[PDB]
Amino acid sequence: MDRVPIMYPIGQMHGTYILAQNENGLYIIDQHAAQERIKYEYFREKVGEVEPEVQEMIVPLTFHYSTNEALIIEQHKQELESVGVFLESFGSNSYIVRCHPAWFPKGEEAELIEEIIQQVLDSKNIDIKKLREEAAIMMSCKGNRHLRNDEIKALLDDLRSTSDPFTCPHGRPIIIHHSTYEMEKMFKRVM
């Protein structure tokens, strides 16, 4: 797939669409879809990394489980480990977490860790590929402003760098393009 060429901001509208252009023509961009594409690939890359920078917690977290649940979790300890969940056995069906990747959404670590662990519970069986995918989604969730052109330019540069600037992880188009040729044809003035 050809990489989209550098795009330059024209402006925005309604805190919803970005208007940009280059020599090729006009780009109309759903700014929310763009942000989702950018965020997903960021976290998906992160969770794939082999040795993240870890952050010890001021206060260690605790989690307690049934004999059924703790057992599911036990087989999948490798998987959870790779997604940034560092469980430490303290007793029967119980776990402690003292640290996490530094790139976890700040201040929502505990919620995230529980949700990841919950995912493994609900499926009973699951592999790294699907878990890493689910985890990056949950991370992208963590939390209509009208963007200035400097913020727009930053977003466009970031979008260009992703593996798919045209369609978001959930199937939404991100970009609608009218080439200069297409624009001339639509106005029928010079063609």
Place this chain on the structure above:
Amino acid sequence: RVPIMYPIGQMHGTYILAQNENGLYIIDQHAAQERIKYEYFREKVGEVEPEVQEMIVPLTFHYSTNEALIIEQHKQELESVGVFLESFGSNSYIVRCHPAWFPKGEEAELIEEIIQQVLDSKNIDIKKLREEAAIMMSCKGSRHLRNDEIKALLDDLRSTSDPFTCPHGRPIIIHHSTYEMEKMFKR
């Protein structure tokens, strides 16, 4: 009947981008400017006695016998659009004046063009010739637009009888409505 359009910007020195509650507007500057000029000239050609201006450089025209017949048949029609032909013998005329509001410096070409429309139609009435002439006038005349220029254009275009379509029937505006944009991005 578009509401106020607020500028987003311009591109390629050719297109203006604008928005309001109804969505996105992409405007061809050149076509917009002709629609704006047309609204003006259509009014002007409708005046029974407009301000007239003597020419510094009078024009001469020669026609075939049959063309001159057609020209004489349409004396009233031609005068109604500001073409004041004066007979001087066989198949020949001079023009010594014209409305002050004829596009400056392009009077000679315009007059010749208007007469040729009459010759080609063979028979044409005042209403249709006024329309054709105003279209011709609106296409006469000669960097990126400044912000005041963009606002003036948007307000002026909006103040015409058809902001969407040019005197020649081509689009002035490509409009992606809120509804259409939501569909495009499958929201």
